[PDB]
Amino acid sequence: MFTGIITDIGKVDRVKPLNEGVLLRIETAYDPETIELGASIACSGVCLTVVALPEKGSNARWFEVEAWEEALRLTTISSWQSGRKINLERSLKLGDEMGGHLVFGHVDGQAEIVERKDEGDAVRFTLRAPEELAPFIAQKGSVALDGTSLTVNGVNANEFDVLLIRHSLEVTTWGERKAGDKVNIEIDQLARYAARL
Amino acid sequence: MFTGIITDIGKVDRVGVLLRIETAYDPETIELGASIACSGVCLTVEEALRLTTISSINLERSLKLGDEMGGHLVFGHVDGQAEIVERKDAVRFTLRAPEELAPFIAQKGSVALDGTSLTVNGVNANEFDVLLIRHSLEVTTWGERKAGDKVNIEIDQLARYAARLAQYQ
Amino acid sequence: MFTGIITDIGKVDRVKPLNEGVLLRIETAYDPETIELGASIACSGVCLTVVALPRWFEVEAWEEALRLTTISSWQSGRKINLERSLKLGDEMGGHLVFGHVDGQAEIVERKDEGDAVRFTLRAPEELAPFIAQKGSVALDGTSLTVNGVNANEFDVLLIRHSLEVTTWGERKAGDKVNIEIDQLARYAARLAQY
């Protein structure tokens, strides 16, 4: 699992279509020696499996992942092209600190940014959630948006707000986000227990 | 994230505002930027001083992957303060919560008071009771608590999800 | 907190009186090296704290738990449902259980129903409004779906497997079980009463 604390901003280097899937090569600051084949890396909130790493002796820093039919459909990955910057988070190991919330990287769908407002040390983003997810977005609840652990600041029907402190905008893809952008949305464990009920 | 099971009593040495806290915790097991619940307030190693008892302690380390969640899901984001009105020797404490927090307090439901995960015993409007066992009064700041004293209150996040479900429907 | 999915059938080995209060020694299939002092273990739905370890573990049931739950009747040889606390990273299923029981219900009838067994239970009147068809309830710490309600009585259907892997196989008409109302249903009723 993950926490929603982004540790790198990766860059989509290569996009190769597969039968009902895609192969992505992601440029990273992570050391590929510390990455295991088959490890899970959250790519803008999407849990994906590492399928390839640079050969022995190479100085290149990248990893390849595959995204299949369901992920291409539900998530923003269908839109990703070469040059796309994405949030990265490595999987948590037994005993690791968890600074955000419990993030599985099992994206529920997409939310749309409908407004972006500067508020001094933070930017307030207003998003539109899919109607099916809306009853499970509660004020003070933990939400993962492009893999970023955020607190729901306020709700208004299918709309909800999140506050992003300036530093978060610099160290995540949130700095690039604008009205009209789609982001991956994952509801927390508590909202899911309310959602299954 | 926390579970409300207190593992240390911290004595405040020197005192927004920066505070120094003595602990039985091994500093070698602690890193910078890390979160620790100080009487229910999640703190990083103005808004807080206003809502919390900090203006005038129980300790819990953040849950790590694999840790058992023996209490309930405590976030360490305090909602306000509750007042102890009577202490009836396990020891029963009657508290008075702010009007805004009373609908989120239910009989046999969960509450986090000074970071302690407690089961709500009885409820009468904004007044509620908690039963604090002998062991808990010694391993927490609950021993020195009496009528008039103010505690940090964190209502159950599950109650907000129940309210949102009913507000939408 | 717990999931209401029973992981072992424990056997009470020793009951030692205390002021409150009892010390229970429970035989288990759990590896005591995986248990730490102070760990919470749901014992037939009652959240109890581990006080000693060497397979068995020892818990203390205080006054309120002793008197309100079926623990007052537990003697050596008693089989109980066991469940370890949920760990951070584990999935929370459809029904979260906290192990703070509301009281006891009594099995008034047990009847075979093909590949399952239908138990009818009587609930205390204070609990009956919280019990709703299709709702989940923890009975002896086992998460079960309320199949139907009829005033202060309700039914649960237990599939053959659940009878084998929990203490439900040996339950009979007249037995008392611990009952815990669903957490979300209590918040919903508390919010509605406003």
Among A150, A190, A193, pick the best mutation site for testing chain B contact (most B Cβ within 10 A): A190
What residues of chain A have any CB closer than 8 angstroms to a CB in chain B?
1, 92-99, 101-102, 134-142, 151, 155, 189-191, 193-194
**In the complex, which subunits touch A with 3 or more CB pairs below 8 angstroms?**
B, C
Are B87 and B34 within one domain?
no
Q: Which residues of B touch A99 (CB under 8 A)?
A: 33-35, 62
Q: Which residues of A touch C93 (CB under 8 A)?
A: 196
d(CA A170, CA A180): 20
Among C91, C143, C191, pick the best mutation site for testing chain A contact (most A Cβ within 10 A): C91
Q: Does residue A100 sit within a domain? A: no
Question: Could you tell me how many residues make up chain C?
Answer: 194
Q: Rounded to the nearest 10 degrees, how much is the dihedral formed by the CA atoms of A6, A12, A18, A21? A: 30
DSSP lists the bridge partners of residue C162 as: none
Are B104 and B169 within one domain?
yes
Are B20 and B78 in contact, with CB atoms under 8 Å apart?
no
Contact assignment for B165 to A140 by CB distance below 8 Å: no
Contact assignment for B157 to A137 by CB distance below 8 Å: no
Q: Rounded to the nearest 10 degrees, how much is the dihedral formed by the CA atoms of A48, A52, A56, A59? A: -70
DSSP state letter for A73: H
Q: Does residue C21 sit within a domain? A: yes
Distance of CA A109 to the CA centre of its chain: 11
DSSP state letter for C2: B
Are A86 and A30 in contact, with CB atoms under 8 Å apart?
no
- Domain range holding C125? 100-194
Burial (CB count <10 Å: 0-12, 13-18, 19+), residue A83? exposed
Host H or E run for residue A193:
helix A189-196
Are C82 and C108 within one domain?
no
Strands A182-187, A109-119: pairing is antiparallel
Q: Does residue C69 sit within a domain? A: yes
Contact assignment for C186 to B108 by CB distance below 8 Å: yes
Q: Does residue B70 sit within a domain? A: no
For residue A1, give the nearest of B35, B65, B165 by CB distance: B65
For residue A164, give both structure tokens.
């992003």
For residue C10, give both structure tokens.
């424990």
Q: Which residues of A touch C34 (CB under 8 A)?
A: none
CATH number of residue B30's parent domain:
2.40.30.20
Entry resolution (Å): 1.9
Tell me how many residue pairs between chain A and chain C have CB atoms under 8 A apart.
18
Among C101, C190, C193, C194, pick the best mutation site for testing chain B contact (most B Cβ within 10 A): C190
Host H or E run for residue B137:
helix B134-139
Are B164 and B84 within one domain?
yes
Are A69 and A24 within one domain?
yes
Contact assignment for B110 to C183 by CB distance below 8 Å: yes
d(CA A63, CA A82): 14
List all residues 6 or more positions away from A2 whose beta carbon is below 8 Å from its beta carbon: A42, A47, A89, A91, A92, A103, A104, A105, A147
Q: Which residue of B has its CA nearest to C185?
A: B162
Are A12 and A83 in contact, with CB atoms under 8 Å apart?
yes
Our CA-based measurement puts residue C3 at a distance from the nearest CA of chain A, in whole angstroms, of 11
Are A35 and A112 within one domain?
no
Are C128 and C43 within one domain?
no
**In the complex, which subunits touch B with 3 or more CB pairs below 8 angstroms?**
A, C
Smallest CA-to-CA distance from B62 within B7, B24, B140, B144 is with: B7
d(CA C41, CA C57): 10
Q: Does residue B151 sit within a domain? A: yes
List all residues 6 or more positions away from A75 whose beta carbon is below 8 Å from its beta carbon: A44, A45, A46, A67, A107, A109, A110, A184
Q: Which residues of B touch C129 (CB under 8 A)?
A: none
Interhelix angle for A189-196 vs B157-168, to 10°?
50
Q: Does residue C92 sit within a domain? A: no
Are C181 and C112 within one domain?
yes
- The Cβ of residue A118 has, within 10 Å, a number of other Cβ atoms equal to 9
Are B55 and B92 within one domain?
no
Are C128 and C77 within one domain?
no
Q: Does residue B72 sit within a domain? A: no
Our CA-based measurement puts residue B160 at a distance from the nearest CA of chain A, in whole angstroms, of 6
Measure CA of the first residue to CA of the last residue in chain A; give whole Å.
23
Our CA-based measurement puts residue C112 at a distance from the nearest CA of chain B, in whole angstroms, of 34
Question: Could you tell me how many residues make up chain B?
Answer: 169
Q: Where are the alpha helices (DSSP H) in A140-188?
A: 166-171
- How distant, in Å, are the alpha carbons of C86, C154, C171 from that of C65? 21, 24, 21
Our CA-based measurement puts residue A150 at a distance from the nearest CA of chain C, in whole angstroms, of 18
d(CA C7, CA B19): 44
Are B43 and B152 in contact, with CB atoms under 8 Å apart?
no
Are C105 and C191 within one domain?
yes
Contact assignment for B65 to A95 by CB distance below 8 Å: yes
DSSP lists the bridge partners of residue B113 as: B116, B153
**In the complex, which subunits touch C with 3 or more CB pairs below 8 angstroms?**
A, B
Query: Determination method here?
Result: X-ray
Contact assignment for A135 to B73 by CB distance below 8 Å: no
Q: Does residue B2 sit within a domain? A: yes
CA quadruple B28, B31, B35, B38: dihedral sign: positive
How many domains, in total, are found in chain A? Answer: 2
Single out the residue in A37, A59, A93 at which a domain terminates.
Answer: A93
Smallest CA-to-CA distance from C51 within C66, C35, C63, C74 is with: C35
Are B11 and B91 within one domain?
no
